[PDB]
Design an enzyme around this catalytic site. Structure first.
Site: not given
Lengths: 116, 120, 116, 120
Positions: C26, C58-59, C9, C75-76
């Protein structure tokens, strides 16, 4: 490579009252319905509410065969009301080669959760 | 190598495809997608997919079913029609798992779209 | 039995503007930060917004080393604003026996995304 | 049997435990849980967990970290403190994967709570 695939679904069942008191956080489902869809006790499930658009995940527990019960218990009760139409789905993983021909288990309903 | 750590990776996606149909009335759950598009993104029938709606910011997950090749259909069915409408621009992705060494060289299958759901 | 465990993280990074135009859906992340946290290009990631409580997945894609960039694209962008403090996490699976001693990769930040 | 279908099953849960601490200020992400409780539910440090807040209906996922044995702490840290408050009643679950035949006989590890986070 491992794919995540639809294992099975209950297609447009109605949320009922619970006949018995079930633990919060779960969805109790008539064992006949679990049998048809291949969904196991203690299996992670997704619930998609067709009535109100809400989507959440929980786990399945067996309600008595014949009870037709779809009871969203506890925290999950914030997302589904009695009479709402929902889809209940479980997913499994398997390698790509097997996933290419995989067929999910689907149960269809009519009337008051009467399985076709 | 038994016990290797397994990654969740983007397998493929349909990038900025347009929703062509949305029906509360039952092909319920799924998103039906032109089979040509599924082929391009490496997405399988009955595969779990994530849909990010760029138009309204909604994010949801469902599973893919094939629509007729050449139909250019993206149909959001059942409960999912509460999250997307005809005209909305979406990204549809699938994820797979694989060991770390494979994940470090993995290339996703991406299909890009313009106009009348024309694949670039 | 296979466990899902925190792989790594980024602990309390700030959302920045994007230096370049990145694809919607993304999150572009300075490659130095990905290296420290063990997060891969194209890996699924969770983003938890400490500022506003929003949580989404997401990625990852690589932003240039040194750019310090945390850009939530498209979108994120509905879920994170420039200046918001977020946690970015990836998860891996492994058998229970290995999971019992597993140690995640954590990167800590100070100032304007300056890695400690 | 290679290629067997793999199920996602409830591994264990802390049923109706009370949140004792909630801090936006950084042990950020995690939920810290008395190690005795982790032991009872079979939950590991750094394991992904789902938290269902029975009090407010919020549902979120994070990962577990151990708090001191006997502390009876349930601390929702960082972003997660926007989803739970001190006093709220929560269910904390972990899920594991296993082949179908194992899943058909699997028994989850469940810990039940009352009063001052007393494990029954």
């Amino acid at each position: 490579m491992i794919r995540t695939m639809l294992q099975g679904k209950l297609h447009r069942v109605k949320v009922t009252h619970a006949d018995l008191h079930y633990e919060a956080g779960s969805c109790a489902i008539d064992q006949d319905f679990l049998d048809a869809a291949g969904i196991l006790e203690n299996e992670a499930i997704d619930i998609w509410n067709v009535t109100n658009g809400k989507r959440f995940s929980t786990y399945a527990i067996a309600a008595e065969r014949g009870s037709r019960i779809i009871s969203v218990n506890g925290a999950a009760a914030h997302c589904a009301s009695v009479g709402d139409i929902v889809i209940i789905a479980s997913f499994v993983t398997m390698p790509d080669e097997e996933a290419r021909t995989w067929r999910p288990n689907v149960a269809y309903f009519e009337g008051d959760n009467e399985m076709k």
